[PDB]
């Protein structure tokens, strides 16, 4: 908790340097909870949900071939229709909150393409003469 | 949910192309649950179990050296006694349900060997002149 | 003499008979006891 959100106003490029700050903070009595068994449930539900959300994101990175990475490259080309901007307009002079608002509607298109790309890559690994 | 089980009647080879379809579907009120605290537990138990089953499979892939992969190679030889068939009898003209019935009794033998193989591989990585 | 090596697959379409607890779901549209214990809506077009 030394920047949980310190990069929020930074540009997209600059904010790429705090990815471990946000990730490490996303998976952070005695008798009362059992004597009054309403609160034991209220507390467990909050804990179970934090775990399920964490795992769903990890499963996607696994499927897309980005497991274990905070920054990962793929082979899906960027469609100009998703955002008609060049790199100097995206990485500089723009925040991640603004970018998310701009892309939002295309999130599922992009995710579907990332999954298709990884499956094609695996198919090419079961053919010993691949990519030649 | 576009094929949760669509490949069930396909051959083992053909079914290898839907591994992301099955994996992505294996880790998918308000007041009622706290007013009637029987159901809060019934629901949490179902959710906790889904998480524990997921994690046990991930731990095994980790131990065997197959983390992050849907298709993974190992160095354990296949024993002819486990199934005396050639590749043209296994990958074609056979389903995964049939294969599982055929192998079942040998599941633990195979898993034990996969763990031994990875440990031997690690030992060879702490000797800078390894495999020469 | 096949010289094959035990590969590992994850996401294999294999299933077994089992006993678990099922949850109730409703049409949303429905002071009725089953309108309260069956809150989660079903998909309007079930994926069969």
């Amino acid at each position, epitope marked *: 908790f030394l920047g949980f959100l310190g990069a929020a106003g930074s540009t997209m490029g600059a904010a790429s340097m705090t990815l471990t700050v946000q990730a490490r903070n996303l998976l952070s009595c005695q008798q009362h909870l059992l004597k009054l068994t309403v609160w034991g449930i209220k507390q467990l539900q909050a804990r179970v949900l934090a775990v399920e959300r964490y795992l769903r994101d990890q499963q996607l990175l696994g499927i897309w071939g980005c497991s274990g990475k905070l920054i990962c490259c793929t082979n899906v080309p960027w469609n100009s229709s998703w955002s008609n901007r060049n790199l100097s307009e995206i990485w500089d002079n723009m925040t991640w909150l603004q970018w998310d608002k701009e892309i939002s509607n295309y999130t599922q298109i992009i995710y579907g393409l990332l999954e298709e790309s990884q499956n094609q890559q695996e198919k090419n690994e*079961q053919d*010993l003469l691949a*990519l*030649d | 949910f576009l094929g949760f089980l669509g490949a069930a009647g396909s051959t083992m080879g053909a079914a290898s192309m839907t591994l992301t379809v099955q994996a992505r579907n294996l880790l998918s009120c308000q007041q009622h649950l706290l007013k009637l605290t029987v159901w809060g537990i019934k629901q949490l138990q179902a959710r906790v179990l889904a998480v524990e089953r997921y994690l046990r499979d991930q731990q095994l892939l980790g131990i065997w050296g197959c983390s992050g992969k849907l298709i993974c190679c190992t160095n354990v030889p296949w024993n002819s006694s486990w199934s005396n068939r050639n590749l043209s009898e296994i990958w074609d003209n056979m389903t995964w349900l049939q294969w599982d019935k055929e192998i079942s009794n040998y599941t633990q033998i195979i898993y034990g060997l996969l763990e031994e193989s990875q440990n031997q591989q690690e030992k060879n990585e702490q000797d800078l002149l390894a495999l020469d | 003499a*096949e*010289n094959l090596w035990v*590969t590992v697959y994850y996401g294999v379409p294999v299933w077994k008979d089992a006993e678990t607890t099922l949850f109730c779901a409703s049409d949303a549209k429905a002071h009725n006891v089953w309108a309260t214990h069956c809150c989660v809506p079903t998909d309007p077009n079930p994926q069969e």
Partner: antibody
Amino acid sequence: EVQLVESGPGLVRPSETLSLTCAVSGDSISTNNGWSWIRQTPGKGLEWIGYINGRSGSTRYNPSLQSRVTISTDTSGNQFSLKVNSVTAADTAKYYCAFFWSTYYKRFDVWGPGVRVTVS
Amino acid sequence: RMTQSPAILSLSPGERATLSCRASQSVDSRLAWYQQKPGQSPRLLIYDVSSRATGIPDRFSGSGSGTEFTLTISSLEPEDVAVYFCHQENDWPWTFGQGTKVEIK
């Protein structure tokens, strides 16, 4: 079952290029990988030249021939060919068209009769 | 690379042939053997050191690993007179041994 049929000049003069065409019957070049050329050099034996992926146009070549060899595919004719930049007497060999299938599940060859080419 | 030996195997009918092939570097198990008869394209016999190809009789077998490999032919018959080749698949360029002949009489 794939059949491989070859033709081209059996005589090339020194400093002239060499050109051989392999016709493919029974399957589509554009669908499979592993289309390749191998030659049998007298006094040396079999040597790999290179191969092409009919699905992409990507190729790989034996380093000793990277400065001279071109492999390409005719997707209309369903034939592929080998071209070699200027050749010398040292390139006299029996040249062959072959198809190599090598995957996790199957291994097989289709290997045609070849063309005898003399450089002189 | 790798080479084969004996260059010529002069064997009696019914005798077992032994043909070796030795690599200077490990090729793991990615080794195949081919049979060359006059006028024919090379025929695949054995792949992945010991696995027999479809349509090949049980008289053909083999073993080995890393750098030391052997092809054997049981009960030689006159139809088996051919030049046998050792083929390296483990890494590029793929290579062949010089080939050796098995002769029967």
